[PDB]
Structure 1
Amino acid sequence: PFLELDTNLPANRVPAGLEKRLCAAAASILGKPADRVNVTVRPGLAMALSGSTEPCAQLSISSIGVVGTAEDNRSHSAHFFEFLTKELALGQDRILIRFFPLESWQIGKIGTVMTFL
Structure 2
Amino acid sequence: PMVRVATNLPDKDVPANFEERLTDLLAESMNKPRNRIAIEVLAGQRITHGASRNPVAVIKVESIGALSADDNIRHTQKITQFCQDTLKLPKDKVIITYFDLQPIHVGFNGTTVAAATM
- Shorter chain as denominator, the TM-score bin is over 0.9
Q: TM-score when scaled to structure 2?
A: 0.93
Paired residue secondary structure (1:48): strand
Is it true that 1:70 corresponds to 2:78 in the alignment? no
- List runs of 5+ in structure 1 lacking aligned partners: none
Within the alignment, does 1:85 sit opposite 2:84 as a pair?
yes
Tell me if structure 1 keeps the 8 A contact 2:30–2:71. no
State the SS of the aligned residue for 2:40: strand
2:107 maps to 108
Partners of 1:71 and 1:26 in 2: CA distance:
15
CA shift, 1:112, in A, is 1.0
Distance 1:62 1:109 in 2: 14
- Identity within the alignment, %: 32
Number of residue pairs aligned between Structure 1 and Structure 2? 116
- Report what 2:4 is aligned to: 4
User: Offset of 1:109 from its aligned partner?
Assistant: 1.1
Match of 2:20, as an amino acid? K
> Unaligned 5+ residue runs, structure 2?
none
Q: Structure 1-normalised TM-score?
A: 0.93
Query: What is the match of residue 38 of structure 1?
Result: 38
